[PDB]
Amino acid sequence: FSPVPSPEGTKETYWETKAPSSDVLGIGAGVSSGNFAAASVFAALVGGYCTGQVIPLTVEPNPLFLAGSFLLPYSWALHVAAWIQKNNGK
Amino acid sequence: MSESVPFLKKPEALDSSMAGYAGFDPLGLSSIADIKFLQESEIKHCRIAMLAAAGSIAQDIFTFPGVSKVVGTAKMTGVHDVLVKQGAMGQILLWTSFLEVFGTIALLETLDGKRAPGDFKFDPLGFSKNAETAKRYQLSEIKNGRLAMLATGGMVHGYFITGKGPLELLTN
Amino acid sequence: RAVPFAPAPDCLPENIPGYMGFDPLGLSTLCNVEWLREAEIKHCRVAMLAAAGSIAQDLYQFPGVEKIVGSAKMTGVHDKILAAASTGDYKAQAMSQILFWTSFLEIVTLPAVFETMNGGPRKPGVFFFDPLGLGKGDKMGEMELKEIKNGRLAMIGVGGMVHHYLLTGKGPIQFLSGIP
Ligand code: CLA
Ligand code: CLA
Ligand code: CLA
Ligand code: KC2
Ligand SMILES: CC1=C(C#C/C(C)=C/C=C/C(C)=C/C=C/C=C(C)/C=C/C=C(\C)C#CC2=C(C)C[C@@H](O)CC2(C)C)C(C)(C)C[C@H](O)C1
Ligand SMILES: CC1=C(C#C/C(C)=C/C=C/C(C)=C/C=C/C=C(C)/C=C/C=C(\C)C#CC2=C(C)C[C@@H](O)CC2(C)C)C(C)(C)C[C@H](O)C1
Ligand SMILES: CC1=C(C#C/C(C)=C/C=C/C(C)=C/C=C/C=C(C)/C=C/C=C(C)/C=C/C2=C(C)CCCC2(C)C)C(C)(C)C[C@H](O)C1
Ligand SMILES: CC1=C(C#C/C(C)=C/C=C/C(C)=C/C=C/C=C(C)/C=C/C=C(C)/C=C/C2=C(C)CCCC2(C)C)C(C)(C)C[C@H](O)C1
């Protein structure tokens, strides 16, 4: 009804192709599909290892293993970005 | 290809004009983040580390009058704990934070592209008016800072293992 | 074609180095050829270090390792060093350093494999590491296929050396010397 504002740098992201344009990756638009795939596996293994090392949680958990455990969900987003980049030819 | 690493491709974001360019970015971190931000951060890390490495050696060589009572034996990281209890560390933090607030404004100007990164126009004694000497001095600053970053980590880890401190460990 | 009975797969290029056409089960079709080549070259280099290490360990030991390691051992050495590292000994932290440096090298050589798979200028296996320049300088000799032949020998040779000492207490030099 009036112009709806968006932050500067807003671009069009609507896609009907096989994979979205690399712009949907934000700052990761230039990273290669191999680099996301290797980061995906690396984050999955390190995150799973760190998660496993603190499954019986104590009052003294290792903070590096807590922080490293956040790599498991981050790896999901990494392999999605790897599929997007492989299907954009990157 | 890259001058540093022959097998890998040349990093796209990095250019020869920028000081301390070896074409070294195998993981391509320069693509992910704005290069101007990375340049400003690298220079800042270099200067803090340079002060840190010189200070680490200096504290072994000599200590300021009256400091010895407050710091009984602790060196490197250990001194910080005692001076944190006393007022030294807090007063340094306060004045550095005040400097950084203006540094935040400077960082914004560098990110916009208006101002060259890492330059605060601080040349109290003229050393870079030649415009040929300036570039050599800039390369010297980058290389010395990189060495000091590596050195600061190297020294502190030796303190962690033995507690000797940089010069004492070399003697024994 | 090494075996005329089983044909060489078309996907395998004749031009690529080290090609004897021995792919009876045609495993080349299943996987990317460039990645398969890189995996082979990397496997050969790691295996070559492992087998010489087995021979050298018996003949020479670095000073002071004798206390931290059993007098004759192979994989036992790895377990012994790890046992002292887990114990908390400062001195026996060799495994972490080897792991860290090899991992760091692998991390920074990671883009190379993907870049070659995208048709990048570097061929598989060439990291341009020839400081001396003598071995690969100018035209070069048959050393390019020599690495592959010695590496394949090293792979099976490591398998033999490791598998012996699993059923026996004998080491590589000892088992070669006396055979029961
Ligand atoms: C990252 C840098 C860093 C850090 C965190 C510390 C931290 C500390 N130092 Mg060390 N020190 C440093 C650098 C550093 N120092 C440098 C560069 C030197 C000279 C080579 C020294 C020499 C030194 C001695 C001799 C002693 C300490 C001591 C101490 C402790 C008490 C604070 C004090 O009195 O310092 C005082 C430190 C100084 C006055 C030196 C600062 C000089 C630098 C070059 C500041 C330059 C500012 C610059 C000119 C302005 C640039 C502006 C630009 C950004 C626009 C504290 C843990 C004391 C201690 O407990 O020792 C065991 C002590 O006796 N420092
Ligand atoms: C996969 C390979 C492998 C593995 C896991 C081990 C592991 C081990 N060795 Mg063995 N070793 C190896 C290869 C290997 N070694 C090789 C290749 C040799 C030389 C022929 C030796 C000779 C050797 C001796 C003499 C001793 C050990 C010992 C040990 C133990 C302590 C670490 C140590 O001092 O090693 C030391 C190993 C070396 C110094 C060999 C380094 C050779 C390098 C890798 C050659 C690099 C060439 C080239 C320039 C590198 C290219 C870089 C490029 C990839 C970028 C540990 C279990 C010690 C022990 O307790 O045994 C009972 C011991 O005394 N090793
Ligand atoms: C039989 C061993 C052997 C051979 C013939 C080769 C040959 C080659 N390699 Mg490979 N390589 C090997 C082992 C070997 N490599 C191992 C073990 C490693 C890991 C450290 C590597 C890592 C490696 C990299 C990273 C690269 C090469 C490259 C090359 C090529 C050019 C450089 C050159 O001429 O090297 C000549 C090498 C030799 C003649 C090896 C000599 C070893 C000595 C004489 C004998 C072994 C000593 C050993 C320590 C044990 C001694 C006895 C012990 C049992 C007591 C060439 C095809 C480069 C390439 O293809 O691009 C240019 C390249 O980038 N190699
Ligand atoms: C499965 C992986 C495996 C590999 C890749 C492999 C390769 C080689 C090579 C290639 C480099 C050589 C040259 C070689 C030579 C001998 N092997 Mg062999 N070998 C493997 C497995 C086993 C097992 C399970 C045994 C064994 C034996 C022997 C004996 C007999 C000496 C004897 O009769 O005592 C000799 C000479 C037996 C032995 O160890 O007897 C205690 C026996 O148990 N091997 N072996
Ligand atoms: C004049 C002035 C200016 C200024 C300024 C300033 C303050 C400039 C200062 C620059 C400095 C402080 C440079 C210091 C670098 C230190 C290095 C490279 C460390 C090397 C140590 C190594 C390799 C080691 C080690 C060690 C290991 C790790 C463990 C130990 O157990 C043993 C050991 C010790 C061997 C500016 C530019 C602001 C403007 C204007 O012009 C006015
Ligand atoms: C690349 C290159 C460089 C380099 C380098 C390096 C490190 C080159 C190293 C090359 C190496 C280490 C080659 C070793 C191969 C080992 C073999 C074939 C062993 C087979 C064992 C068998 C068959 C057995 C056995 C048996 C016995 C004895 C014991 C029994 O218990 C078991 C069993 C019965 C099975 C340099 C530095 C030159 C620079 C250059 O610019 C580029
Ligand atoms: C904790 C604590 C404190 C503190 C503190 C401080 C000062 C902490 C600072 C820690 C630092 C600076 C660590 C840096 C480590 C550098 C590394 C790992 C790089 C290694 C190089 C590598 C892997 C490869 C290098 C490479 C080689 C070899 C070949 C390839 C090329 C190259 C890249 C050159 C206090 C002060 C609060 C006190 C408190 O009571 C306790
Ligand atoms: C330190 C560590 C460990 C470890 C470990 C290690 C190092 C384990 C290594 C295991 C290996 C290499 C097993 C492979 C065995 C079989 C081989 C090599 C057969 C090759 C020949 C074939 C297939 C045929 C070839 C052929 C011939 C005959 C001629 C015709 C052609 C062809 C058909 C090609 C443990 C496990 C001890 C545990 C410990 O806590 C931690």
JSON list of C-alpha atoms in Angstrom, two decimals, chain C residues 12 15 18 22 27 32 39 45 55 60 62 66 76 88 93-94 101 104 112 119-120 131 146 150 162 171 173 178-179:
[
{"chain": "C", "resi": 12, "resn": "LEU", "atom": "CA", "xyz": [40.46, -45.47, -18.56]},
{"chain": "C", "resi": 15, "resn": "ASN", "atom": "CA", "xyz": [47.42, -41.73, -22.60]},
{"chain": "C", "resi": 18, "resn": "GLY", "atom": "CA", "xyz": [51.02, -45.74, -15.39]},
{"chain": "C", "resi": 22, "resn": "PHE", "atom": "CA", "xyz": [44.70, -53.96, -15.70]},
{"chain": "C", "resi": 27, "resn": "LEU", "atom": "CA", "xyz": [36.07, -50.32, -11.28]},
{"chain": "C", "resi": 32, "resn": "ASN", "atom": "CA", "xyz": [35.73, -40.47, -11.48]},
{"chain": "C", "resi": 39, "resn": "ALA", "atom": "CA", "xyz": [43.82, -41.59, -4.63]},
{"chain": "C", "resi": 45, "resn": "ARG", "atom": "CA", "xyz": [53.39, -42.21, -1.27]},
{"chain": "C", "resi": 55, "resn": "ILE", "atom": "CA", "xyz": [62.82, -51.69, 7.78]},
{"chain": "C", "resi": 60, "resn": "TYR", "atom": "CA", "xyz": [68.28, -47.75, 13.52]},
{"chain": "C", "resi": 62, "resn": "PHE", "atom": "CA", "xyz": [66.70, -42.41, 17.37]},
{"chain": "C", "resi": 66, "resn": "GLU", "atom": "CA", "xyz": [64.40, -47.31, 23.53]},
{"chain": "C", "resi": 76, "resn": "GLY", "atom": "CA", "xyz": [53.08, -51.92, 18.83]},
{"chain": "C", "resi": 88, "resn": "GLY", "atom": "CA", "xyz": [50.30, -37.73, 30.31]},
{"chain": "C", "resi": 93, "resn": "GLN", "atom": "CA", "xyz": [53.58, -36.76, 21.95]},
{"chain": "C", "resi": 94, "resn": "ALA", "atom": "CA", "xyz": [54.95, -37.88, 18.58]},
{"chain": "C", "resi": 101, "resn": "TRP", "atom": "CA", "xyz": [51.19, -31.77, 10.34]},
{"chain": "C", "resi": 104, "resn": "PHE", "atom": "CA", "xyz": [47.41, -29.47, 7.96]},
{"chain": "C", "resi": 112, "resn": "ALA", "atom": "CA", "xyz": [43.75, -29.23, -5.64]},
{"chain": "C", "resi": 119, "resn": "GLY", "atom": "CA", "xyz": [39.46, -29.31, -15.51]},
{"chain": "C", "resi": 120, "resn": "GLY", "atom": "CA", "xyz": [42.04, -27.14, -13.77]},
{"chain": "C", "resi": 131, "resn": "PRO", "atom": "CA", "xyz": [63.46, -28.48, -5.18]},
{"chain": "C", "resi": 146, "resn": "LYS", "atom": "CA", "xyz": [59.08, -45.72, -11.49]},
{"chain": "C", "resi": 150, "resn": "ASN", "atom": "CA", "xyz": [57.61, -48.81, -6.55]},
{"chain": "C", "resi": 162, "resn": "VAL", "atom": "CA", "xyz": [52.06, -55.40, 8.83]},
{"chain": "C", "resi": 171, "resn": "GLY", "atom": "CA", "xyz": [59.94, -57.67, 12.94]},
{"chain": "C", "resi": 173, "resn": "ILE", "atom": "CA", "xyz": [64.48, -57.50, 9.27]},
{"chain": "C", "resi": 178, "resn": "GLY", "atom": "CA", "xyz": [65.09, -66.18, 9.75]},
{"chain": "C", "resi": 179, "resn": "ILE", "atom": "CA", "xyz": [62.02, -67.87, 8.26]}
]
